[model samples]
Target: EVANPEHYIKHPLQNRWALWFFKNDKSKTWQANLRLISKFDTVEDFWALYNHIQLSSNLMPGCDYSLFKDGIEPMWEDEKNKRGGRWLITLNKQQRRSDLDRFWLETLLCLIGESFDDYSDDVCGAVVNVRAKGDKIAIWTTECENREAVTHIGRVYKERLGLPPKIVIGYQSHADTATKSKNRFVV
Candidate 1:
């Protein structure tokens, strides 16, 4: 008789996250533009999805990819994200051509891997915006006023991304971003 096969080994993450996709369509409402592609709770599944999807750099302009905790929607109106802000990393056009995809993947890995340890709880999710003018990557946190948690997350994020110490990233509250204001709390 054949030996019984071993069940597939799975690597569990600290939290489950869902991957979302957005494509701008004038015919659709803003909410309709967004779609939840899938959710994964294991490392193997995450990599499988990552490897099969189009990279952020490959997505058309006006599109976005957001990865947030399983139950958290990637929108300002979401209860978990309502009072939050994002640590914004504005990437120039050239960087989009060169580093966008890699950076986004690393960011996702950092989140799922719980690289921030205790600070990971403060993270709501992350968004990558593909635009003709410039691309942006932001890590949304649960609270803008939580200076200690926000700053620590930003510092660790920068280090995890291997960014130069001289480079700067700013944190912008959703209130300011929503109102089209420039008021930002720099970390």
Candidate 2:
């Protein structure tokens, strides 16, 4: 008699996600530098893809990593994100060494784990920018004006990241972010 082992069973995620990688090669155009790494729908598959890639800390400055729903592009130009906003978490240069990868991974887990319960459907994607001056991580949502959903997502994200109460993260609409507008929602 043959029986399947527990390890052989794969846990499926609510949504399929695509991982994107971006490198700042002056020789290449912005669109050319950004490429789709892989897409995963299962927990095991996600870990397989994750372990196979370079950690955020190991990436060079000016690089970025994005995880978005299978059908949506990571950029704001995407139809799913045009009216969205992101909950931005900026890390200092020193935190890059200690917190960047951890926070990024936590963000991914939050997405796959559906930590927001009812508001999970409002989430669009997440991004991590490895910069020379400071690193930044953001979870993009599908609506900028849905106060209840956006705030709920932010609260759960901050808690999942283990950020202290003193730390405040802001949510900025894609439109406002582009123009550097002062209007933003913070929690």
Candidate 3:
């Protein structure tokens, strides 16, 4: 009993997002291995894409799933990402069986639901890297210098993930990650 030409509404997200997939092809250049799969702006659209894709765990090692704002490239060279850093959540081999899907789903929900509060705008996107070494998931935000928002986001995200108090995750700017590994903002 709810049909009207003018009453239709689709839940909208604050930003449209695009999904990219990277498959390692030793024969090809690095950039050639990455391609954009799809973009979505509404809740249903997101699910349609999600349900239609292979689970991250099923992807071959050396592959990655990256979700980013519509206009932002996932690479560090992108203007929007060059100044940014990510909050990395690394999962050891054992945790993949016990918690990969759950953690990834929760990360997606936090992104689309604006669960980060006012700081959500600072978020650019997220990525899940599938590697034989160990899998990693990260939430990329636009600034590392904005201590107030960056730490708040880190604390909220960590709590939401239910990580133990001792399990600290740090944010490292692209500048540092490109040069070395230790430059980090601890949370």
Candidate 4:
């Protein structure tokens, strides 16, 4: 039996995080369609919000759900995201029914659990884009040039997600993605 009062207190995350929602409303401006849902910094709070929201698979095509460290918007233009990159995992149509929700949940867990260890600090956030052709989930990192940290984060993320070796994920810098530059790293 444990007696530490702190043990009964809510366990806090290392960094505060924000969850954002984006809907491709044709009549609205891009910024108008995007809004913050809530911010959480403790284990209990994260779960409460997670259970309250709709699953990624249920979101309409062109909609996206993004979870980012507090103060960092989901867009690549954010100061914290401008120099960063993401490890992208794309799912085919067939896998959407079978694997989409699982992977998305795991991705969320990885971010909130600090699954990357020391590299967790390097993480900025993650996004899941539900599209008509295929679904995508990406974990964003703060720096693309930090190869060691980038690779390590990729490896751990891949393993944690239990992705098969046959499925390869690539890391692409925000600038590169914007300019159509090829991926610089894969795992």
Q: Best by lDDT, which number?
A: 2
Q: At residue 37, what lDDT does model 1 achieve?
A: 92
Ranking by lDDT: 2, 4, 1, 3
Work out candidate 3's RMSD over C-alphas.
2.1
lDDT per residue as tens, model 1, 1-187: 9655456558888899999999988799999999999999998899999999998998999999999998899999999899999988899998997789888988999899988888888999999999999999999999888889999999899988889988888888998899884535664
Better of 2 and 4 by TM-score: 2
Can you tell me which runs of candidate 2 are displaced by over 4 Å?
A: 1-7, 181-183
lDDT of each: 0.90, 0.92, 0.87, 0.91
- For lDDT, candidate 1 versus 4, the one ahead is 4
Q: Candidate 3: which stretches are off by over 4 Å?
A: 1-8, 181-183
**Candidate 1 residue pairs in clash (backbone atoms < 3 Å):** none
lDDT of 1 at 159: 89
Candidate 2 local lDDT, 1-187, one digit each (tens): 9777776779999999999999999898898999999999999999999999999999999999999989989998989899999999999999998999999999999998888999999998999999999999999999899999999899999989998899988888999987773436887
Residue 36 C-alpha lDDT in model 2: 97
RMSD (Å) of each candidate, 1 decimal = 2.5, 1.6, 2.1, 2.2
Question: Worst ten-residue run, lDDT, model 4?
Answer: 175-184
lDDT of 4 by residue, 59-168 (tens): 99999999999988888898888999999998999988998899999988899889998889889999999999999999999999999999999999999889888988
Number of the top TM-score candidate: 2
Pick by TM-score: 2 or 3, better one: 2
